[PDB]
Design a binder for this molecule. Structure first.
Ligand SMILES: [Br-]
Ligand SMILES: [Br-]
Lengths: 368, 367
RNA sequence: AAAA
C-alpha cells in the first residue's frame, strides 16, 4: 500500500516542522535544511529517530535548488506525499511546491502560528487537536528548563498576603524598594534599615517579618508579613511573579503555568531566568515581571530570550506595578512586547479582567 | 501598458524597498496585514507618488484567493512583477500562482545578499546599488542622529591604542579599577588603589600618568598622551575606536560609524551601538567590551540588531579577554559572531583572523 | 510559521 511521506522544510523555527509531523503522523519524514539550519533539523530528527532523515541544500541558489529538488523527487516512488512549506526560504517553497505538485497524490500544506493546518492544494483547513508540551518545545529550540516552580508549590497564605505586600509598598515605593534590595543582596542577615527610620526585621522565632515604611511626610506604616514562604516572596519581587502566575493560572486560555524558571547551558551555567511561562496550547506566553523599569534595555534582553527559547510564535508580556516611561513603552512597541501596568489597570485587587482582555486581543495574531 | 509591481510586506521592510528600487516601477501595490501596516506606511513614504497600500489577512485562504483574484482582475493590461520576498507563505503561494496565469508576469525574490532571483525564468542578477544606512534605519523606524567617525579622532589617538592595551595587560584588574574610578568621577585628578596602582591627570602637561602594579612586587609606569586621551580612557572608548579603525580598512566596508545612539520620540536614548558598518548589501553591527561580565548583554545586543537593521544583518561581539563557554553558547543561540582579540593574535596581529571569520559569514542567509 |  501507498506510504504516507512528509517532505518538510526546516527554517529557523523548529516548532512548525515538529507540529506538522505530529499532526499527520507520517510513515516517513524528509527534513530539508541548509548548513545554517542543520542543528534545528537534527533536533527535530531526534524526536522521530526511526522515520526521519535529513537532506541539506543551499537556501537560495536556484540552480542547486531545482537540480536537487528534482533529484529528490526522482528518488521517491508513487506514495502519498505531503510537503510542509511552512519553514525554509521562499526559494525552497517556490520550487518544492511546483515540482511535487506534478504528482496527483501530493498535498502542499502550511501550519500557522495558531496550529491551523492549511491545505494549499485543496484549499481546506483544519485545527490541530493537540497541545504543545513545554519541555518538548524548549528541547526542540536547544534548551531545557530543569529548574522552576508551580503556583501549587506555594501555600495559600503565600497567595493571600500578596495584596498586603503591595499595599505596604505603595505607602512609599522608594523606601520599600531600598529595603527589599538590601534583603535580597544579604538575605541571611536579620535586620535591614534606612537612615529615615524604615526597616525590615526577620524574627526567626515567630517565623515572621516586621517592617516599617516611612513616607515623605514623616508618617510610618508598621506592619507584619507572615506566610509559609515569606522569606522567598520578598527576594527579588518573587511575590509579584507569583501574583501574575496565580492570576494567569485561572485564565481560560492557560493550560499550564510555570514560575521562576532557569535555563542553563551544557555545563549547568545559568543562561537566563524567566519569571513566568504560560502554555497556551498552540503557543507559549513568556512574562517578565518588575516592580518598575530602571534599565530599559531589560526589554531587549527579554525579547531575545523569548525568541531563543520558544521561537517566533510566542507572545511576550512585560508587567509592572508602576507606570512605564515613554522610552520603555516605545521599546516595547519596537519589540512587539505587550506592556501592562497593574496600578494603571485597576490595582492589585482588580486588574485581572483588563489583563485578560489585552492578551485575548493579541493571542490569535500571527507574529511578523 | 504599465510596469506594476505587487510586493508582499512582511516584518522586513528592506526586501520590499530594495525590490522597488531595482525595477523602478510606475505603480507599486504594497500588500500588507494589520500587523505590518506600519512597515507598509514607512515604505510608501519613500515612494509616496507611486505606491498604494492594500490590507489582507495573512493566512485565511478564502480571503486571500478572493482578494488576490480581484486585484489581478482589476489590472487587465499591465506587466506585473510580484516580489514574494516578504509576507506569509500563504500570500506567496497564491500570489505567485494567480498572477503567473499571465504571460506578462514575473515572480521574483531578493535575498539577504541583494541577489535578485527571477523565479519564473530561473535567472539571477546583482543589485546595482548600495545600502544607505539612514534610509534603512528610517525604514525600520529609527534615526541615528548621533555618531562619530574614525576621522573625528586624531592620528595620535590611533597610534596610542596598543600602548593602552599593553598597559592593561600588565594587570587587567588593577587597570580596570583605575579606569572605572576615572570613568565615574572624570574631573578628579588623582585615582589610586590600596595596592599602589594610580592614574593621574597632569593639567599642565595635558597627559595621563599611570602606574599599574602586578601581583609579584613590580610596577609598570607610563605616560598616556593623545589629543582625546581623556575621552579614549572613558568606558573603554579606545577599544571601540580600534575596532572601528580596523574595520575601516576592510575591503568589504563602505562606511564606518562608531558611538551611535538611537533615541525615542522625545530624544531619550533607546540603545547605544559601538560600531555600525555598511557592507553595501547588508549592515554589520559591533559590540565591544574589554571582557564580558553579564552574559545577558549578548541578548540585549542581538535584539538591538534586529530592531534597527533587520533580520539580514550580521552581528559581531568583540572582546579583549577570553569569551567563556557560557557566553559562547549564548552567541550560538543568537547567531552572533564572537571574537577574542587576545586569543586571535593580540592587539597588533588579529586583523587577518577577524577578516577571515567575517568573510565566511558575510554571504550566508540568516534563518 | 511574514528576505528561512
Ligand atoms: Br521560604
Ligand atoms: Br510558492
Amino acid at each position: 500500500h501507498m506510504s504516507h511521506v512528509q517532505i518538510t522544510l526546516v527554517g529557523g523555527q523548529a516548532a512548525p516542522v515538529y507540529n506538522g509531523i505530529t499532526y499527520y503522523n507520517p510513515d516517513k519524514v524528509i527534513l530539508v535544511c541548509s548548513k545554517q539550519t542543520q542543528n534545528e533539523a537534527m533536533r527535530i530528527k531526534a524526536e522521530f529517530p526511526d522515520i526521519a532523515e535529513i537532506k541539506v541544500m543551499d537556501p537560495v541558489n536556484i540552480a542547486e535548488i531545482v537540480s536537487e529538488t528534482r533529484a529528490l523527487a526522482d528518488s521517491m516512488p508513487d506514495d502519498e506525499i505531503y510537503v510542509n512549506i511552512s519553514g525554509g526560504t521562499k526559494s525552497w517553497a517556490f520550487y518544492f511546491s511546483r515540482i511535487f505538485s506534478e504528482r496527483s497524490n501530493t498535498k502542499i500544506f502550511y501550519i500557522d502560528q495558531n496550529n491551523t493546518i492549511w491545505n494549499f492544494t485543496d484549499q481546506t483547513h483544519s485545527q490541530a487537536n493537540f497541545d504543545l508540551n513545554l519541555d518538548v518545545q524548549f528541547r526542540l529550540y536547544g534548551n531545557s528548563l530543569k529548574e522552576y516552580k508551580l503556583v501549587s508549590d506555594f501555600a495559600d497564605d503565600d497567595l493571600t498576603i500578596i495584596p498586603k505586600i503591595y499595599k505596604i509598598r505603595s505607602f512609599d515605593k522608594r523606601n520599600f524598594g531600598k529595603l527589599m534590595n538590601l534583603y535580597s543582596e544579604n538575605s541571611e542577615n536579620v535586620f535591614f534599615d534606612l537612615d529615615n527610620g524604615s526597616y525590615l526585621r526577620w524574627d526567626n522565632e515567630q517565623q515572621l517579618f516586621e517592617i516599617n515604611i516611612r513616607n515623605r511626610d514623616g508618617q510610618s506604616k508598621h506592619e507584619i508579613l507572615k506566610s509559609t514562604h515569606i522569606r522567598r516572596l520578598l527576594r527579588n519581587y518573587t511575590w509579584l511573579e507569583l501574583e501574575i502566575a496565580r492570576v494567569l493560572s485561572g485564565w481560560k486560555f492557560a493550560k499550564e503555568v510555570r514560575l521562576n524558571g532557569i535555563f542553563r547551558d551544557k555545563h549547568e551555567n545559568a543562561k537566563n531566568e524567566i519569571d513566568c511561562i504560560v502554555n497556551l496550547g498552540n503557543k507559549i506566553l513568556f512574562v517578565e515581571c518588575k516592580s518598575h523599569i530602571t534599565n530599559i534595555t531589560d526589554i531587549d534582553k527579554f525579547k531575545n530570550a523569548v525568541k531563543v527559547y520558544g521561537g517566533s510564535g510566542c507572545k511576550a508580556l512585560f508587567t509592572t506595578i508602576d507606570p512605564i516611561r515613554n522610552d520603555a513603552l516605545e521599546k516595547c512597541r519596537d519589540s512587539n512586547i505587550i506592556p501592562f501596568c497593574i496600578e494603571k489597570n485597576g490595582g492589585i485587587n482588580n486588574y485581572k479582567s483588563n489583563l485578560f482582555e489585552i492578551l485575548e486581543k493579541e493571542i490569535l495574531n500571527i507574529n511578523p
